[model samples]
Target: SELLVNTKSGKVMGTRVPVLSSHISAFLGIPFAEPPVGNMRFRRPEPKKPWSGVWNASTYPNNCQQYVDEQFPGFSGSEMWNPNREMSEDCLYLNIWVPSPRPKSTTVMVWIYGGGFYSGSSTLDVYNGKYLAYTEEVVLVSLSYRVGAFGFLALHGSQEAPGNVGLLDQRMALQWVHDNIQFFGGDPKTVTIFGESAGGASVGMHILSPGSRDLFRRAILQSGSPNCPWASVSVAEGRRRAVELGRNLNCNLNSDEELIHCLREKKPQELIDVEWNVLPFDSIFRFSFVPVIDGEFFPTSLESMLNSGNFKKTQILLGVNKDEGSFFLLYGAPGFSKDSESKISREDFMSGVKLSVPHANDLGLDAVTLQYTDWMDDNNGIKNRDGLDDIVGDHNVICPLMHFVNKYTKFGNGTYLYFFNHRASNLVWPEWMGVIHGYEIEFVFGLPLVKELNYTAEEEALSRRIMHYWATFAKTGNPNEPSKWPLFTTKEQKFIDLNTEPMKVHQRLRVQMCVFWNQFLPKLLNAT
Candidate 1:
């Protein structure tokens, strides 16, 4: 009960909890910005006015309205799953964990979550920062931001619903940390921002945003990037979605202005109840419910920005999984078979190319198929279904990420890349599913190291090593460990392969596939 701390906002009472052996003071559910309800729904977040009395930082904050019941069938009940019991529009709060050995010697790590910009929370069991704080001795921070319609519903060509409030919410939290973390003995100058999936994409967004300048020193992007198809939608694309959502909501079918006003008038839950098919995620990992270039926060197109080298030159660690699209493929009642000869009939695969990429050329389909196919008795027969998974992964996750990392390193500092081949342990399925998206997030948060797992010891060891690497990077600017983690360069394209045993620095990661997607496919597409 002796964990009271003074802040720029107020005198807040925190919890002193035992971690491993030592204790870390946890300050939970502190508001960084004002409630985004009422007329404040679509605008940039406003700073929360100071509160009087000892503000209770005891309870967990409500997650911004999100799909709380979302689960990856195989790994649903695992600690990695985020089920925000308390969710609301008034969910702009953040949490902080201060180590026992802090006087003036701690670096801060702030986390932003990813759920297709739909559902995630800081109060999830795996996001617990106590263990990481105790062991790594770095301050841990996690914050909540809007999701779904509340976050990314774009009303074309108008200030009413320009979209991307979620990203602005993250920026406001970083501002709070910059303004107040010193009170908790954290060095404001040494802040590292990191995340997975949408959260990972958000880190990429921060690196590109001019408003997010000087707030962070380094960034860790795990399986996400702005270049990813679902990361940002164009104004025209958003208008299409806004129209669709409006028509379904039965709002005034008059114009963009009328529909937005109608949507604004309805209760927040009314908006969430509708399946705003903003982007067809199942088709090409392209989800309409995500960030958009709203001119102000997102100044210009991400592609243009990359080519022009227009972004913050911060040190970054960006990487992706070997089979990033496996999770998306398994989403629709996945029934896996242990065989490897069943190709998913070329006819059926060819038919879906248009759905996956609207206006897809016929020859493009042939090229895409030939490039990413189960060549030998490669895939599990009965269609190990691996071919489709690889295409989706490369187009939506891997290729975009590799291209982004290559471009980012040209301007950024000490950028490191990693290939996570370590087959993660989950209680859900057999050995069919290899390392999937966000399997490493659980490890870094010390979930496997702290929880009683039915998994193996090697997984636990990987968790410890990840925590060490992450914490060390937060302390310094680089993620190098002895001769272990080497810096990534565009020419050599070096990377660290994360695993159970000793880590290996490698120069290859689907190098040929990346070429096919980034260069080879493009030339063919332009060819007459």
Candidate 2:
């Protein structure tokens, strides 16, 4: 039988599907905000008005407007990350999955996906929450936020287009979940907000934001954080890019209001098409449009906020994969040819470092290279591709995450850290790629629970263990059940390594390297 839940919008009907021992009531495409279109183009999202009849939420909704890769839809390299539905500006929707015979006052988990904040969809196949919700008996929710130009376009001092509308959209959704998740058997007090990459950054921003800090109690950040170099830009940088976008799209005008009006008049596709041209550099490290430090959303710099103890205090779980850069090297930046088999030459490696860390002087570059170099294979450029991969992975994902973990754990909160090292058995990419970015997502979603994927017995067990850890953490704030997992502290710096048979706890994850990247490198960059 179908399930009907009464929400703020209206009564919405959901479909049911049987799981191993139970069933899940799936509600897809629930609108949390009014559509961002026409007059609402660059402005903040408005709350949706209550509708008359039961809203059919069986089908997934459109993704936010962004450039979709042609290879994304097929069984290619990008297939796992593509959106299952169409794209439109009117894409402010959320999906919910509840365990059948719903338990009252259940802990809730809301997911935010990551595509560097420019592209992502909650409806992606790999993000399905059926197994996680059913097995854990928790409510799982995922929501779509605007991406790319449509999401982050900033106009300096203009009310028509205050920046970070994408973040505002997420805040609105959290507010909606806080207000209405009780109808679906979730506790507003025990809600957990988790995300990957940009979504992780968004969660971090929410943790720091005054507008969003109170909505959730626990946060899980997988391979992303606000401390990362590419996570955001200054308001001046964002304004320059915005004006360039206007010039590129032939919307050039004198005033901010007039420029925004002109830009809004153009179609979404037109704005997205102009995004590539706006960036001075074509490296993946540079995003044409990204979150700006608008005085309202981000009151001040991240450093100032953390230093002043101004962010929301909550239990946290965060980690990074082993080879996060391999995938990006193959498909991310433009200069690097898309050939997966090509070895990174010394020139290529240094060029990449320069592009990814443009502010770095020769001394900073030399220091980073010293830290990442494979001393044994230092002479061989071919074998040193691993070094290049480490540079990208550490600089972009690993160090920043560790830095955040260090900052948070120093304050004496319950913090857990993990290092995702296992590679999927069913992956289409070559083995050399080894535990790349986004590889841990399938396991996090309990993909191995389905027998059809034919995950090995050990891998399936690992998936179950991961689900248990995540769900138990959501409910009790401590992931330890059968095993005694240690808490991450500034002194011990312990983190769980996920690739081992028994999942061992290790201390001081890349101690010296993290120091060089997080502490020393910044000083070198700023040295005159």
Candidate 3:
């Protein structure tokens, strides 16, 4: 039998499917905001009006305006990850899965996917919540926020498009869920916010945002955080991106309002098709279109705000994969040739590092290379494989997350750390999918939706455990059950190295390297 739930939108119907041995109800494509189109373009998201009754939410809705495969004939980065979904400007939607015939209200987990904040969606089949909701007996929700220029182009002083609309969209969605999730058999008071990459960083930033203070009680950041270099942009750089879009569009950029008006007049595809050659992957994750510290949303310095520990207090589960940087290989950045067997030249490695790490010239690439390399002058890529990836991973993902946990735990917040070390079988890369960025996502959702890996009995067992751990953490702040997982603290930093049989490796990941970036470099070179 089908299930019908009454929502703030209207009476909505959902599909029922047997999940594991039990059944669950899924309500897909629920609109939470007014479509960002026409006058709404480049402005803040507006709340959706009340809808008519009997809304069919069985199918997923349109994705945000993004280039299709035809537009990217040579680039399948967009195609493989962001496949054939019908997309449009009106793509602010949320989906929910609730365990059917609930005995009582259950804790909820709302997922925010990560594609470096430019692209990702809830409708991606890999993100299906059936197993988690069904097996864990907790409701699950995944949402979409605007991405790319539509989400975060800071046209300075416009007041119309200050920036971080992606965050604004996320905040609004959380507000909607906080207000309306109760109607879907969810405990709004016990909601958990979690995500990967940009999504993970968003959860962390929300902790600092005054607007998002009361949205959730717990947070799980898979492998992203604001401490990372890519999470937010400077005001000048934000303006640069805005003007770049305008000049390319043949529009005047003397005034913010005028530039926005001209840009808005163009079709979504026109805006989406700007060929980028800026960063390592210009068309991929450009610097111009990311979360920015607009005075309104991010009024304070990110470091001061986080270190102060005066923000919202919540239970946290944060960790990085063993090879957090391996996923960048899939990005196929410009200048890095696509020969599968070709070893990365020393020049190629440093070029990529300079893009992400500032002040490399002052500290010198030689220092980073000296610390990270395997040989005196290694030319073979395999010999120096871990060098660049390790540096990038530590610089961007690992150190930032660890620093975040250190600050938070110093203030007595309960936190659990993990290092995802299980490598999925040979499906992801030219070879191994070794603990890569977002490799743990398939396990957490208990779905074999990764294009790389197929389901195995052992992996399924891991998924079952992960889903339970996450669900239990949502229901209760503590992630460990059956045995106690130690809380991370300044004095005793406890972490689980997630493997077939997990163990702890280092109290701190590469202490000398971390000191080089955070402490040593700042004191010696003033480079940070």
Each candidate's lDDT (Cα)? 0.77, 0.84, 0.75
lDDT of 2 by residue, 201-278 (tens): 899999999989889988999999987888888888888888999998777578897788888899888887878787
Candidate 3 regions off by >4 Å? 67-80, 275-286, 329-342, 356-359, 375-377, 448-453, 502-506, 522-528
TM-score between candidate 2 and the true structure: 0.96
Q: How close is candidate 3 to the true structure, as a TM-score?
A: 0.92
**Model 2 spans with C-alpha error above 4 angstroms:** 71-73, 332-340
What is the Å distance of residue 461 in model 2 from its true position? Answer: 0.7
* Backbone steric clashes in candidate 1, count: 11
What tens digits encode model 3's per-residue C-alpha lDDT throughout 175-211? 9899889888899999999999889999988887888
Instruction: Report how far residue 358 has shifted in candidate 3, in Å.
Output: 5.3
Instruction: Give candidate 1 misplaced runs (Cα > 4 Å).
Output: 70-82, 280-284, 333-359, 374-384, 523-528
Q: What does the lDDT read for residue 143 in candidate 1? A: 83
Q: Which of candidates 1 and 3 is the stronger one according to lDDT?
A: 1
Q: How far off is residue 338 in model 2, in Å?
A: 6.2
